[PDB]
């Protein structure tokens, strides 16, 4: 289990995103749910998986009562996705300076069907991340020493020895997919690179639903340089052959949506235009019928000159 | 399709709950999620499936802009449940007087796996409920003339002609079963009878997770006469042959948790499965049975009253 | 001086609106401003001229301290309009039960230019409305027996004997006209008829600026029958001889702006000045006429309903 | 067009106030109004002219949608005063770091009478301040290269190429006046110098109305030094000959109003007492009958030992 | 023990106020303080003695958890007063419907000095009020059949059988007198009659300190007929022989303080002690008498109405 | 009168607490009340004695109107305790930077019985702390040059020459006590030393009542070191001989109450166990019957491994 410091978050993201095409599979934004837990006295376990960063001044996180008599506190979380292989994750103890979780370990298990709610007592649990030490009010970026778990997993269990507080818990993993949305996160797609993110993130583009407001989308500052543009490179969770339609949803972007957009395709060198410059409108699902055969592995959305987009869909085989 | 007036809700349930063994398969509490919609100008589409009763003042409901160019507005909702057969539902237009939905019609569709977010266009959409008329600020309890739909669906589509507002949308259906939690709502269990429901319904007993607070559970009024007790009759999604674990969870109930609880089983005459046991607060109570019985309906008894969050029943057959 | 009961508001308007062509010349919405007052101990004098109806709970009104040493309390208000002849007004004592104004009397005055803030002392103050009696928590609609005052004024003074509270003070008067906006309230135009007023009155159509939000405009209920339309009949401050520009402004109406609008002219039989045109949201619609017509009353028609912020009509004569 | 930095605001105020006797003639505090504008999506154009300084955390200013297709956005503001000559002004882009207006130019025009609402299209518009560049989150103090415009103006137009945000817009100008209030701002009077201002400003003394609270008055910290005093030198908008009465209004100053006051007069060298030490009371209009003939150009109010005053009036010829 | 219905409150007071000369000796306003309690799970025990009437929504009252193992829940309250004899009180179960206190009983105890906080256990606790039954959301005005208790107490104990909620608990008793303030509540004075009580009762006149705001005083409605006056008849804790100072305190009454006040004395025919004097706001009015009179009941007269905070009367005997 | 700086607060506390066994006898937390005052215009005199530290952004303190004509402003405060000897105190002018009280002096007086409310005019007042200078926004720790006043006192009077603001006023004094609670503050007990205080203070343990929430108790951070503990040494206000029972109340500490506690006794050298390790529960009054004879002067409560306690009682002779 190698650790990373804020100083090298760049490298950490590289090991996680670019090299292992993984995502925070327990995040609520994508479907993650809290199945159970041992205690939740000062702050709810649900706080652990929210998309927003921890706020202060009540605590934004999971804090249990004091003096646990059990060897550890715990929580069981079900991935939003069908299953995935784990590479690493984050444990943020933000604003918990002292009463933070002293040590933490993670376990996983695979449950064929939604037969019921998993119990912490289940015999299928398996250690995914050996016990390690946490520091106060900080982020712990960690990767498994051997990398991607060779087994598939559906539920994960966080353990805090013996109790305390954790602000956020992120667990990155390679989605094991179930005509389909090739750029859908639940199908294995992930956001790779991007010009910039002001609010929201490029990985919001590959999510379920149209969202609730502009916060769950991808937005970029108001630029001024001529010929300026913004872009996001998504790696479809499965190389295409036939792309029927590409959808660019600007839902909730009413006064800051892009002026034009263009989509391109690349195969694991040259980029090919799939949807040339197209004037876009506010809060709409602009649908582009491609009906073309191409072997693309990556898609690139370009916002011009900048703006906000909620989602991008790429239906095909 | 028959409609029921408020003074007939008693019979309405009879049709959907006792007879058809249905439950609200699109509500959030259970996993219902908005996939998309044509517009949400004045009020968010997600409000539709909330578990709370509409609240006044912003509008606690769904509302599109005026003068729709298309023939109707729509919202696409994915079932929380794995699949279900439909019988009817509720369309509450609360607090929308005049600008309420003139007409509504419902369509269902069956999609195998989360390939992506279904589109209005999809040629699999079929009419499940013929277009009927809505009135100002009221509830519309309806049931399909032909009872349950022979087919089973995973997503439903609501159509409002041509635009306006709907406060709530409940769609009732019989869940299709995917050791298993035999009382778990996802496996087809439903609550038929209850002695009392002061706060939170009895159908909360059979849901995923442990919830957020006392509101997603079952709570009865405070009683005074000796020997008084409250109960909930639950129909297992399948008859049992063997039962290993029964779990009564009082999570979140700290000052009003029941004093003692018992669990009796029946085949449709009652047999004791769990003898009178003193319960505690915000705790999971695990009772080992290791016995074999052919019970179909279970009955939780809390004494003298109080609240319980969940009841699990692990068995076979 | 005659008074009208609520069940007579219908006739009240007839007298002031249709007959005398008056408008509330001291309200803030139109430019009314408090110049000074003798006291505002419990509630601000500025509340008097607000466009909203009194709201309960602080007191939404004007209230002076108890036991006034002088004979009466007073407030001096300057007309928004350039000058006007008075017919009557409203004195709403809403929510002031018992400590309401026992008596009230009104005085007017004509001051050329903004030399400074007029004083109570000024020897130009003349009685326009004889001292009458007010009752607890109610509205007092009154009209001068001698109709319009032969003279024209710029400031008015309200006297409360000897102290107490008044929720609202409306003073109706016929504006004195200073290419010109012939429908502009400052030039003497007034709205006589309207098919409907769900939110915001039709007299908002003829005001300065584009307003703040949807509240300072005209909005009609959402309609359902085909071919339904809503309208507003406006009397120009002067008959036209030539009309160059007509402008329909829907500023702030983004989801309920009208679909199409038309403008007909009449001389007091209607003539089309602006043919059916599709309108947009939060936009100014400029229609060139370059024609000559002797119209006195204009009529805006929005289809099928919705809201409009302003209507301008530039002409001659 | 010479610019000034916060470092030399002192000199800027000198060029504007002392040398050109000008005031912020479009300020709402004095009567400035927003007539129209091109867009107002993120923040209202009315925010531009409010008396208070820009606050943060919604934006306190004027921000338009993105990617304007028109060459520039704009707003038309009507001065509170009858007319004035312009010398300069301020453009604050506070808290707009990046999305601020890249460039700005100002235009003016004179409209004989309130014939209607001016259109940005009017042919009378005249460039008053050539296009210049703005920086992020900062104040831009600017003066016209040639100084006071030889022409009179009533409306001014701010243009933002092509869109963005401006926090505040101040436009200083010499008021062209219409027995009168010689110290009335609408008559050309201006606050020249002053010992100090804690809350509110000395220029609040020459405003219309009695105000709403202590914020629109002039207040000084609680001093302790013996024989300490505070003063404000106003320059009447017109040399006097006969001063009938001087009014000192302490409206809204109930616990921090001055203990004594004295008024003096000077002619453009020696100061002459007009109202000697006079014990003052709370929330009152202390009226001093002078009935004296004097050629004063400047008036000086002295607060002892300190305190709060709402307004000072000086009636005469 | 007799109970009185609301339509009998008139008689209730007669018994406790005029006859027995009692006052609410446990309310906070007067010094009542919670010493301890068995439980406060859903609602704080301190709410019981608040001077305000119960307010809805949290619960404005006292509420213990469900299923008490002991026979009853309890709260221990220490009298503000030095000691008192009990006659009866009020038990308001407002807003507690069903989960209200089934039964209640009261016990008193006399402890010399503040040795510590009394315990439920203490063998000095004696029954003062036999266990009676309470109903849902209502007031219970009761009086002891045997009138005043022969003994005097310092602390009282409320017992709720077995658990539930009580909104308010008033306990009436005749205070035991420890130059002295002869009208001071702690010396046994009580208010018998008043002409009017619009805001705040007359018994506030005789309390410790000057209070917090206008709410802890006596305020009468605004009157209109000439010569109208309001009064309060107060019974001194002892007859006077000599009276040196009378003090009328209008602290906090700034805009509704009385205009003039007078004070007459009587022996139980009235004699003037303080002649008509003009009163001021938020000020203490000290009137020297230096005379000897055998008065027992004093009478404060405010003209024409208004509010007064306190009335002190220093004398001998 | 020697002063102390924040730098030597440690020494100041030593002179006050350890050497003179004194406490803040006018604090509201212990019973202190405001009897009267000269003015309270900007901020209530009651703010002076609240237990919490001064907050900002209305002012948290006592601020009077400006320009007092009287030689000084003042306030009369009654100690919560029966009487005490004074050693020193604190005057905090927090957040009052400039308008703070320039000078201050303190007076005291003894009133046999609660005969009435003391007047600032009383002849018994005695100078306890000669007039001294205060600085802006700071704490003034001061001790009487000669120390403990040889006389007993019940009321104290703060004087501010001539007016301004004081944030807090603390007056430490040795309590003159009235089977009893030997560790009760009202009996002369005081908190001496302690391992640490996170929230609340160790001196909260010796207070009246059970409190309102966790803020009026003694709590320590969540520790992690093995064998870690927390303790508080109380000095009984009177050496014991027979200790009947010791009570440890953990009221309001539900999730952070200690796991075990032990009480010890010492005589003015060796510590003796009085209550050995005892598992403690939440929100309960753990009662320990000692029924032992011992000459202890000091008591020591030990929290293990840490936690929160509301009060400790020690009944005996």
């Amino acid at each position: 289990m190698k650790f990373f410091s804020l100083a090298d978050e760049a490298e950490f993201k590289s090991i996680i995103i670019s090299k292992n095409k993984a995502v925070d599979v327990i995040g609520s934004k994508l479907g993650g749910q809290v199945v159970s837990f041992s205690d939740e006295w000062f702050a709810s376990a649900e706080n652990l998986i929210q998309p927003t960063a921890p706020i202060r001044d009540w605590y934004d996180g999971w804090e249990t009562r004091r003096h646990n008599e059990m060897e550890y506190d715990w929580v069981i979380i079900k991935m939003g996705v069908a299953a995935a292989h784990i590479i690493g994750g984050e444990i943020d103890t933000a604003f918990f300076n002292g009463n933070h979780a002293p040590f933490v370990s993670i376990e996983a298990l695979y449950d064929e069907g939604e037969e019921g709610n998993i119990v912490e007592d289940d015999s299928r649990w398996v250690e995914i991340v050996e016990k390690f030490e946490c520091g106060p009010s900080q982020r712990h970026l960690f990767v498994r020493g051997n990398g991607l778990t060779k087994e598939r997993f559906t539920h994960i269990k966080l353990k805090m020895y013996p109790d305390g507080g954790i602000a956020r818990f992120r667990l990155y993993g390679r989605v094991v997919p179930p005509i389909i949305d090739l750029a859908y996160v639940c199908n294995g797609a992930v956001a790779l690179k991007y010009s910039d993110q002001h609010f929201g993130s490029v990985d919001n583009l590959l999510l379920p639903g149209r969202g609730h407001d502009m916060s769950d989308g991808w937005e970029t500052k108001r630029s001024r340089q001529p010929g300026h543009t913004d872009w996001a490179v998504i790696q479809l969770g499965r190389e295409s052959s036939f792309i029927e339609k590409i959808i660019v949803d600007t839902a909730h972007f009413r006064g800051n949506f892009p002026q034009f957009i263009t989509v391109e395709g690349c195969l694991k060198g040259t980029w090919v235009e799939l949807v040339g410059k197209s004037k876009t409108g506010p809060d709409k699902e602009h649908v582009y019928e491609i009906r073309k055969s191409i072997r693309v592995s990556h898609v690139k959305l370009t916002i011009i000159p900048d703006g906000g987009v909620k989602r991008i869909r790429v239906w095909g085989y």
Side-chain angles (χ1 to χ4, degrees), chain A:
Chain A
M1 198 213 304
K2 175 182 281 67
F3 289 68
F4 292 81
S5 47
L6 298 195
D8 302 303
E9 187 167 357
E11 183 184 355
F12 172 71
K13 272 178 284 176
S14 311
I15 297 300
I16 288 303
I17 294 182
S18 58
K19 274 299 176 175
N20 286 286
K21 320 299 175 311
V23 154
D24 173 9
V25 303
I26 56 175
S28 56
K29 90 201 308 171
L30 153 168
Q33 279 161 169
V34 175
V35 176
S36 186
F37 45 75
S38 43
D39 187 60
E40 199 183 62
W41 195 258
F42 300 94
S44 292
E46 288 182 4
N47 290 324
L48 287 174
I49 60 172
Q50 295 304 115
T52 61
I55 291 76
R56 184 176 190 153
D57 217 311
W58 128 288
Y59 271 47
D60 192 4
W62 179 49
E63 172 170 52
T64 57
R65 41 98 198 72
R66 275 152 74 150
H67 328 304
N68 184 195
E69 265 163 299
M70 297 297 251
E71 35 175 351
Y72 61 82
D73 257 307
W74 56 265
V75 53
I76 288 173
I77 301 169
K78 188 169 176 287
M79 297 164 76
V81 170
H85 296 277
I86 307 294
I87 23 295
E90 176 182 325
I91 277 286
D92 197 3
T93 55
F95 317 110
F96 281 103
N97 184 294
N99 58 301
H100 60 286
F103 291 100
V104 171
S105 77
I106 308 173
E107 301 182 358
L109 117 189
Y110 187 96
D111 177 35
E112 236 289 48
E114 187 40 50
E115 89 240 306
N117 298 285
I118 302 300
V119 172
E120 107 85 44
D121 172 60
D122 198 301
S123 76
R124 315 210 280 301
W125 280 118
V126 186
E127 184 135 67
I128 286 315
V129 189
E130 52 288 310
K131 172 178 173 180
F132 76 82
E133 198 174 314
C134 292
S137 193
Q138 58 193 66
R139 293 174 64 213
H140 306 305
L141 313 175
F142 54 84
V143 184
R144 302 182 77 245
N146 294 316
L148 226 44
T149 68
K150 49 196 298 179
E151 316 96 280
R152 295 184 173 186
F153 292 121
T154 49
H155 305 220
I156 99 84
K157 174 160 71 174
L158 182 61
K159 300 179 152 192
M160 163 163 49
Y161 314 83
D163 50 53
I166 304 289
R168 287 293 190 281
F169 178 23
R170 312 298 200 200
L171 193 68
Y172 306 107
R174 189 168 205 165
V175 171
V176 167
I179 196 176
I180 76 299
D181 192 344
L182 299 168
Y184 198 45
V185 66
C186 293
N187 282 317
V190 48
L192 283 182
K193 296 189 177 184
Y194 58 79
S195 45
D196 217 82
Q197 304 172 172
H198 194 212
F199 292 110
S201 46
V202 287
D203 58 283
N204 285 168
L205 303 166
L206 322 184
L207 300 166
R210 297 191 79 204
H212 175 259
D213 60 16
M214 295 188 296
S215 72
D216 35 284
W218 171 54
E219 171 176 4
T220 57
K221 278 198 171 77
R222 195 182 297 227
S223 69
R224 301 297 194 184
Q225 322 90 301
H228 174 85
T229 71
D230 275 297
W231 45 271
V233 177
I234 293 79
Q235 183 181 308
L236 308 171
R238 198 284 279 289
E239 290 176 60
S240 82
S241 61
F242 177 62
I243 296 178
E244 177 174 60
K245 66 160 95 75
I246 289 177
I247 293 175
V248 183
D249 193 356
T250 65
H252 296 318
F253 289 86
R254 307 197 168 85
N256 63 312
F257 58 94
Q259 175 165 45
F260 304 108
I261 71 90
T262 80
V263 179
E264 285 179 348
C266 171
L267 177 56
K268 190 62 174 185
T270 71
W271 290 87
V272 180
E273 211 81 16
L274 290 173
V275 191
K277 285 160 294 165
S278 303
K279 192 179 294 175
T280 44
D283 199 290
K284 233 68 168 198
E285 284 189 58
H286 306 61
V287 191
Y288 303 99
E289 305 286 18
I290 301 299
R291 294 299 196 82
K292 305 302 189 182
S293 51
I294 30 283
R295 315 182 204 85
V296 272
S297 52
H298 303 263
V299 180
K300 178 197 298 176
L301 172 62
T302 289
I303 310 308
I304 304 155
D306 51 66
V309 180
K310 210 68 178 294
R311 308 272 199 273
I312 183 165
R313 312 303 189 188
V314 188
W315 292 85
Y317 310 83

